[PDB]
Amino acid sequence: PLKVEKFATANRGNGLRAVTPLRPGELLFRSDPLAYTVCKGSRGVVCDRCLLGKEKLMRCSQCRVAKYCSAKCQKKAWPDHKRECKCLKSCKPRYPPDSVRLLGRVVFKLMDGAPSESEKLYSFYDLESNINKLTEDRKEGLRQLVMTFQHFMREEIQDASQLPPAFDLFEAFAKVICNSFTICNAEMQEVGVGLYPSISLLNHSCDPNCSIVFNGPHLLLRAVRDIEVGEELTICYLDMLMTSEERRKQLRDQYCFECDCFRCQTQDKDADMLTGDEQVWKEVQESLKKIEELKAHWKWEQVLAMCQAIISSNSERLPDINIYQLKVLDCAMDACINLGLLEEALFYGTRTMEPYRIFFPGSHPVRGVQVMKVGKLQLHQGMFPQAMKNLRLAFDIMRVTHGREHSLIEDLILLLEECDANIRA
Ligand SMILES: O=C(Nc1ccccc1)OC[C@@H](CN1CCCCC1)OC(=O)Nc1ccccc1
Numbered sequence: 191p192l193k194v195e196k197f198a199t200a201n202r203g204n205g206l207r208a209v210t211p212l213r214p215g216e217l218l219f220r221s222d223p224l225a226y227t228v229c230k231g232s233r234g235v236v237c238d239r240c241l242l243g244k245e246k247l248m249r250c251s252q253c254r255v256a257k258y259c260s261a262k263c264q265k266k267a268w269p270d271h272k273r274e275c276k277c278l279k280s281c282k283p284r285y286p287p288d289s290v291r292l293l294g295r296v297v298f299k300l301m302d303g304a305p306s307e308s309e310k311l312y313s314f315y316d317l318e319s320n321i322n323k324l325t326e327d328r329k330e331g332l333r334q335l336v337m338t339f340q341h342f343m344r345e346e347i348q349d350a351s352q353l354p355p356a357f358d359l360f361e362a363f364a365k366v367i368c369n370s371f372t373i374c375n376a377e378m379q380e381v382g383v384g385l386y387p388s389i390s391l392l393n394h395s396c397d398p399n400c401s402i403v404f405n406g407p408h409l410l411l412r413a414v415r416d417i418e419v420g421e422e423l424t425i426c427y428l429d430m431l432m433t434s435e436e437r438r439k440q441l442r443d444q445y446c447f448e449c450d451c452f453r454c455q456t457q458d459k460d461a462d463m464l465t466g467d468e469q470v471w472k473e474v475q476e477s478l479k480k481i482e483e484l485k486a487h488w489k490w491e492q493v494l495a496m497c498q499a500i501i502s503s504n505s506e507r508l509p510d511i512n513i514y515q516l517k518v519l520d521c522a523m524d525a526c527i528n529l530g531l532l533e534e535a536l537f538y539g540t541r542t543m544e545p546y547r548i549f550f551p552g553s554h555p556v557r558g559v560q561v562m563k564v565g566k567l568q569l570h571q572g573m574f575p576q577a578m579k580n581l582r583l584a585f586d587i588m589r590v591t592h593g594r595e596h597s598l599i600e601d602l603i604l605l606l607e608e609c610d611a612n613i614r615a
Pocket residue numbers: 376377527559562563564566567570598601
């Protein structure tokens with residue numbers, strides 16, 4: 191009972207196409223991960239199982255690496271965790287890269303788990319490796335990952351008899367490179383990485399007709415515009431706040447392809463993204479390397495101090511449509527929200543609104559969430575007509591990008607009903 195099918199494309203490998211016309215908001219596929227793990231920066235901040243941020247988390251007894259919010263989460267995680275637990279115990283004080291911990295979970299799921307529904311349309315065995323396009327530099331990095339894997343997993347995997355038949359570690363890490371999904375929480379904070387082999391049939395577009403969203407580790411795939419019969423389904427692999435040049439480099443380095451899409455041919459939005467003084471935004475782009483690192487580790491006080499030094503600098507400033515200024519405004523808004531500084535969060539949040547409209551066209555889940563945050567801030571401060579306007583805009587977007595199957599849509603409906611009741615009274 192599916193509206194999509196695998197097919198062989200003319201020049202981008204296998205892909206997914208619609209077998210019937212699709213309309214905005216239509217759910218096309220949903221999947222738990224084949225395997226997933228919390229990311230470096232969120233380890234110890236979010237529960238290893240449900241990926242939610244809780245202040246009280248309990249370490250697993252044996253390895254004291256995995257953390258859980260509840261007995262329920264520890265129990266539901268134990269099948270995925272039992273064999274890596276001894277390895278993490280084996281390997282402390284060292285912690286292995288996310289990709290190595292992820293592939294460990296793949297190998298254990300394929301060795302010990304029932305066939306996974308995440309592989310319904312496409313399996314880990316099927317995934318693109320791009321090995322004949324990897325540079326010598328990439329291949330050397332892959333060889334280091336293999337040896338790191340062999341080290342980390344020695345307590346549980348000694349020889350090939352404990353790997354799937356004809357399982358090649360080098361090809362396996364090559365697949366992880368170009369098929370890994372970044373798992374975001376409801377607030378669009380990156381909290382994990384996973385493999386979803388059926389979803390990995392989707393080729394990329396800088397102007398996609400589909401979008402994915404995460405509800406915990408669970409993934410929803412939705413159409414975000416009208417799609418004709420037989421049309422290829424695409425998602426955007428990349429953050430929207432990137433120039434065509436930046437997209438080219440990342441698509442080359444990680445995915446081994448050159449994008450022929452119409453936005454890349456025309457450098458669509460590049461000029462407006464880079465307005466302001468070049469010397470100023472080069473420095474902000476540098477500072478953002480540390481700001482985003484701090485944010486990935488949830489160090490909100492330090493994020494905020496670094497952002498304020500830019501937003502309210504004594505030296506030259508950038509227009510809010512400059513993508514690097516815009517990223518700074520967004521980091522500062524999220525830090526204020528997490529620190530309970532709601533007046534400041536709203537000031538930064540409202541400044542992001544018009545640039546987000548430009549740079550996230552149509553229905554994009556990231557703009558839907560940003561608008562909902564600004565609406566919620568306005569609601570908590572008693573600005574009801576303005577909050578209502580933004581909450582309704584968020585719903586117009588998120589009914590398409592998130593849908594009834596995403597728990598966040600229920601929370602938005604509650605905010606809509608509360609803010610409406612405040613206006614009616
Ligand atoms: O209150 C805040 N932050 C917050 C506060 C004021 C203004 C803007 C944001 O976080 C609480 C957290 C816990 N939920 C409490 C209510 C239902 C159960 C879960 O959910 C969220 O609101 N996050 C969220 C996610 C996406 C978009 C907007 C907000």
